[PDB]
Amino acid sequence: MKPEDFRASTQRPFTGEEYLKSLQDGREIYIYGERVKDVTTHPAFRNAAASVAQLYDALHKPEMQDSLCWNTDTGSGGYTHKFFRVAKSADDLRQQRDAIAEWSRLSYGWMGRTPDYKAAFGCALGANPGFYGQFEQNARNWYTRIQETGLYFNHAIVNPPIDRHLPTDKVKDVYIKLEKETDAGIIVSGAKVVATNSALTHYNMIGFGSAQVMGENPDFALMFVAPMDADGVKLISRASYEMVAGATGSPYDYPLSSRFDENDAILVMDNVLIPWENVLIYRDFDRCRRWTMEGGFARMYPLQACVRLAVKLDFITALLKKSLECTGTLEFRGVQADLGEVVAWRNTFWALSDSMCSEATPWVNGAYLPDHAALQTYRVLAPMAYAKIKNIIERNVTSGLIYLPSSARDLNNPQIDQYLAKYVRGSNGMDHVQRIKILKLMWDAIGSEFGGRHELYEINYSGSQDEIRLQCLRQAQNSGNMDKMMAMVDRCLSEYDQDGWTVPHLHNNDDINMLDKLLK
Amino acid sequence: MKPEDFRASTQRPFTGEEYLKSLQDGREIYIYGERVKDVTTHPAFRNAAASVAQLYDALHKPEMQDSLCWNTDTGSGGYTHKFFRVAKSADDLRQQRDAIAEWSRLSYGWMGRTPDYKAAFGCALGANPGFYGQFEQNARNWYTRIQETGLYFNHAIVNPPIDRHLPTDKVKDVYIKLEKETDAGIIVSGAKVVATNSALTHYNMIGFAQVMGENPDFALMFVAPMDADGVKLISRASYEMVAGATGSPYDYPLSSRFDENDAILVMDNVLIPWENVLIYRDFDRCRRWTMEGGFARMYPLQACVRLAVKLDFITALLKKSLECTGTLEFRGVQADLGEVVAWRNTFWALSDSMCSEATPWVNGAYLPDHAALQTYRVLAPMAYAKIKNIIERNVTSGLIYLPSSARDLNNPQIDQYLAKYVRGSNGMDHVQRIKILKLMWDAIGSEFGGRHELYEINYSGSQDEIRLQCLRQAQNSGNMDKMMAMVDRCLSEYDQDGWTVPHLHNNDDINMLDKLLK
Amino acid sequence: MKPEDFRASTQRPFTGEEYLKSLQDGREIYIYGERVKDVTTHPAFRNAAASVAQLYDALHKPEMQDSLCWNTDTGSGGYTHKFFRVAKSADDLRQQRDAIAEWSRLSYGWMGRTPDYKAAFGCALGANPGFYGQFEQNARNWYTRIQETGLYFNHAIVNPPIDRHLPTDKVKDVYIKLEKETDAGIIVSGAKVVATNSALTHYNMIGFAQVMGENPDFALMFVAPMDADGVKLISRASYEMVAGATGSPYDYPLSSRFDENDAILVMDNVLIPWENVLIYRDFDRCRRWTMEGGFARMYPLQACVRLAVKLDFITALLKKSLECTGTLEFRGVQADLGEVVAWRNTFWALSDSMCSEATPWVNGAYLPDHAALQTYRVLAPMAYAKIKNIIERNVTSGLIYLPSSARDLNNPQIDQYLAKYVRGSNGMDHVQRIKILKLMWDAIGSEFGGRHELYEINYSGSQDEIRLQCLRQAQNSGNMDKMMAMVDRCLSEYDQDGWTVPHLHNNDDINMLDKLLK
């Protein structure tokens, strides 16, 4: 039973109901010391699963289908989310940018690992399948499959944060490695860092870590895909903000934690058989080193991430204004100036996504890639912008983020509520129910455990502070951008020497230099 | 004589030679306690004048006309710099963006007040002349004049930094005001804060301590020639003259040719003819001009591109400087340079968005994306201060381990030690190493570098003001209401009793609080 | 002739006049492609020399001797600056802190390499002479000599910024190395990075691209007179000369008297007598000197006080500058000035802690709190860059709305407009307003201001190195192990089954997970 066989039609991706049915499979997930029986009904995952299911439902609704979907390029006569099909122009990238924005708005920018994130991987396979050599047909088939079905992939690429001071092949007891080569496929074992929302995915792409030196053993030089229900695949979940908010809070108290929690799970592979049809790069140091620059994925996914963050910043910006209307401090110059800077950061990420599309270039086989410099720029700025925005919220909303009753239960008890109505009202006529609601929404965005995890995510998810900057420099150098900037500096330098100007339009200083007269 | 009458043709802007001749007028400029006889030959201005003259020469080069010029829209059959005529599409704005970049590369991004900066004012007059009421014909004529000739305007808008704690009605002894209304025109007196490069301009636009007040004699906008009686400039110290008198082009390569003197602008009982008046004793038009005039919604396109060109230069110069010292091999150094690259990329991406998201305005004119203009203004001071700190903390002693002068290289007694001990890393010779690092020092640490940091931090407004204007744009455009509609939708999806949407599970079956607090 | 033989008495340090006479020796200095005949009269050095001479004169003033001087500990019956003799208590360090502050106030915190900076080296030699083995007597003699005379030392320790990607063994064509061992002493050649104010010093201590390597010919520490054959300086541009040639004291008040020329130090086959050798072909002593020598554990007391004095000056000057513009009335401006006040307070509080937490070392000597020294080094670059940004973003156009020269005030034709339009706020006259703002600009934006920013950011090491050394101090002192004992205690108070301490309640009675996940 293929997960896409739950669809009532082969000419469209899953509906939300078919997607939920596709998750009631053999996946082996652990949380709070027990195996999850059904991820769609379990109290740690049911609402995050329902939230992803809503994205699938939106693909078929007349109210969103046109902004979200295109026909497939496969000859099936079907349709798919625009970002699941290879772009072949700058306008195609702009349409994909808008389709990503529309889906992201459904979670207010809070779900960062929705199916469109890894759809860029499906497109990378379809745009350049020749890169994979003997595995070219697997790349072509995987592109067709992902595009037609809307299959939900995530990736587990970063190695566990253990023995970082050593090359990947020197942490053999932990990192993903080839165990055995057989006729049916390859046996792999090891673990990857947290695989965000992988409990709700169909497949994971398992790839080599690029920020850590690989070494000299080719058994670590692998790229392949694994279904979430493959025997030996195990997820060990982190604490569930969804379950905690359900057990000890309410949607009113924790409105984001209760529906958008993407569990960052440890991914374990215990002697998993990967069929040859799922192998993409095999014991190949050459292809592993070339994949970041030639594969296309690294040159596609930040378009999705930049738009998703820009949507979250649309939400945070207006929510900060709403929060300041609660306290009444929005009337002050300093407060307005701080909110104005949040507006500037919000505007920045939308402008970067515009440039990604307008400056797009042809690649291979007619495929277009977004502006690579803009992708690297989003990665560098986002951690700085996010940390600054959170600090601005805390230093302006101040006590408004803590002057809040424990629970919706307090509002529902008239003995407590009578005091909340009088003493916890909003400024200028706003009732206490709305005031507490707005400020709890802001606190869940930045200070709840979910808010704290989101700050950790925005700071680190695409790489360390040094790595994102190194990659930004490498792009400038590899593209020829640095050589073009250097040609301008070399022109400036060529216009004079130790004797004076070499250009005839400027005046030498022989008639005005006073040093001989002063020193000789 | 009109400055444009120096042109041998009415079908093109000035050549560099005609531009220089046009500055040899009756202008009253002071520097170092003396009157400046001729800005084109004076040692404080001659090279900055020659640098601007090069921009005019570039307009007439066949290899550069495709990027720099377009036909006029006046019916003269002439041509002009692309940014001197009203944009009528997103593509027109992109071509203007490129024409600004091409001119800016001629000064490596260091001249921030070149003729294209105020060409946006000429275009604002041409795009919306109806805004000016009875002065509509002046707006139309000034647009035609600026466009055809390439007339060099600057503006003096910011009031002197005196009694900022008071409104623009309680400091009448200093600020620009109407003093007499006559048949020939208006008599004005007062001063404006530094008018950058105004010593080399043909005209200055004079426009309205933030809060204006209640006296309409201060509610003015008009044009003044640089050679009108009573118009005078009191110059600041000349980095060009100092670099010439005590340095050399090798030692101070930017100071020696790109210094834009920030002069105090004084108007002493100046007669402004009615043909030069645009807004007269009109608080309503003065308050509406920032949002309806167009200029405030056009010039940051020029300034963002000009900065992005300077960042192309600084980025590669930082790489060159780190190649000198050999520290470019280290991870931390590469990461810091990578961040400079990210800031450089940002300002180009903002200029892209300004053009692609452009909107129709009035009479077929297009305006760049307003949010992107406000974003450039907010980010630029932070990016510039951060980039300078990154250079200083990475190039470190390389910026000071330099001989005093090109005279040290030209003395073999000293040069023998420079050749051995002040060589560049991995085979680079000492002449090139010292040259690169002196170029970087002139960009950030010389008095010229220091002034450029003060300029990038402040020129479009105080830190609070640029942020306030960014917020106002979000509110006035409807952007804030659209972001708010998303927050209100999120809020509408639940209440104190649970979800109001049917796809989510209520917590009644899992909430343990009742069972826990008996 | 010995430089101290210029003194009319052996029982006190130099007077200013004797100090100036002592500099009129055979020193080989270059600037602007020419040999400097006499540093005391040359226009690039005369005022900086006069400024140092004033510090020596202050030692002999009865009104200042209580704060500045103590008896020598040598048995000579003489006196010296307090920081020139070994501290033997926390109170001795506090009195030295005050004596440093008093001398620093004479240059308003702008001279960072005055004779008291290297007096810490003289004290390090006197406190632990046994460290130097066979060179112990040289350490004792040098301590006595520096203490009694007030000899002016600087140090040249940092290698030229060339081939930083290589160790101090693979750049032999540049770095200081032993070339010959003889009966009279050692022959050395090489260069060091800028030796701040070395043109005005008597001697330089020469000491060991970070990683040293494996060749012991580079493992040296020794003293060299400024007039030894082969010792020479190649000066950087002179802010003093430039301010004199093209400015005035009114226009550049700090550049004109406190410029400490950052000179390239060259040693060409210099003979160093054995009496001047301290560490010889000894990797063991070179590696142990940073932790056992004492100097690295003494000089940041001088530097922290000197910066705190400069911050007293900058803080009040920022208030004065904001009184000029009138913006001091606004909340945001007052808040920014308040932060400058907080940074100024910090460096004084660090100097307090350096003294009160002082510890015994060897032979009765006391050392300031090592953690506070490392903290000053880490915070100072961040505080300085932030303070400069605060000044620029608040004083804004006040720093550029200034006439070129005192010559503008002395020309009534220009001065009439300065009096009206460049007056200060609320009654302050234009002469005082321009004077205050030019003083602030010379502090931060002139080439001297730019060099001072580069100095404060980098002089004690790169951003990573100062932080690494701060961490190493925490580890080596046992501070980190004591902080770790608290974290280990916290961890020991529970395990995977619950609390291990009896005062806390386990969650068995309230944990709902079993009941929820059936």
Ligand SMILES: Cc1cc2nc3c(=O)[nH]c(=O)nc-3n(C[C@H](O)[C@H](O)[C@H](O)COP(=O)(O)OP(=O)(O)OC[C@H]3O[C@@H](n4cnc5c(N)ncnc54)[C@H](O)[C@@H]3O)c2cc1C
């Ligand atoms: C909430 C969250 C969700 C995530 N989801 C996913 C996911 O779905 N899939 C996935 O594959 N990954 C995921 N990640 C991992 C993420 O991509 C990484 O955290 C990021 O790439 C940084 O790598 P790292 O954690 O190994 O940090 P490191 O690379 O180990 O950096 C830590 C520190 O060590 C330094 N350092 C490390 N190596 C070196 C070196 N060789 N030389 C010098 N300094 C070095 C760094 O500069 C930094 O200061 C997620 C992370 C978070 C926080």
Ligand SMILES: Cc1cc2nc3c(=O)[nH]c(=O)nc-3n(C[C@H](O)[C@H](O)[C@H](O)COP(=O)(O)OP(=O)(O)OC[C@H]3O[C@@H](n4cnc5c(N)ncnc54)[C@H](O)[C@@H]3O)c2cc1C
């Ligand atoms: C090198 C340089 C070149 C320039 N060239 C030109 C030019 O050619 N033409 C031109 O017209 N201008 C020019 N300017 C002026 C520039 O536009 C201004 O400096 C800028 O607009 C900031 O205004 P300001 O200097 O008056 O600072 P201010 O507005 O006075 O700000 C200083 C401080 O006071 C605070 N403040 C001021 N007013 C208030 C208030 N009402 N309420 C609360 N806080 C307040 C600010 O928040 C800030 O902290 C130039 C400036 C520089 C530095």
Ligand SMILES: Cc1cc2nc3c(=O)[nH]c(=O)nc-3n(C[C@H](O)[C@H](O)[C@H](O)COP(=O)(O)OP(=O)(O)OC[C@H]3O[C@@H](n4cnc5c(N)ncnc54)[C@H](O)[C@@H]3O)c2cc1C
């Ligand atoms: C105005 C001024 C006056 C001075 N006066 C004196 C004086 O009188 N006497 C004196 O001896 N010195 C003096 N100095 C030198 C000063 O002490 C040094 O600049 C400081 O120690 C920093 O060392 P550096 O310049 O070699 O920088 P570097 O150490 O070369 O650092 C530059 C960059 O390279 C990186 N880097 C360097 N090496 C490594 C490495 N191995 N691994 C990783 N990254 C690395 C750093 O992290 C940094 O990002 C002065 C400096 C200045 C600016």
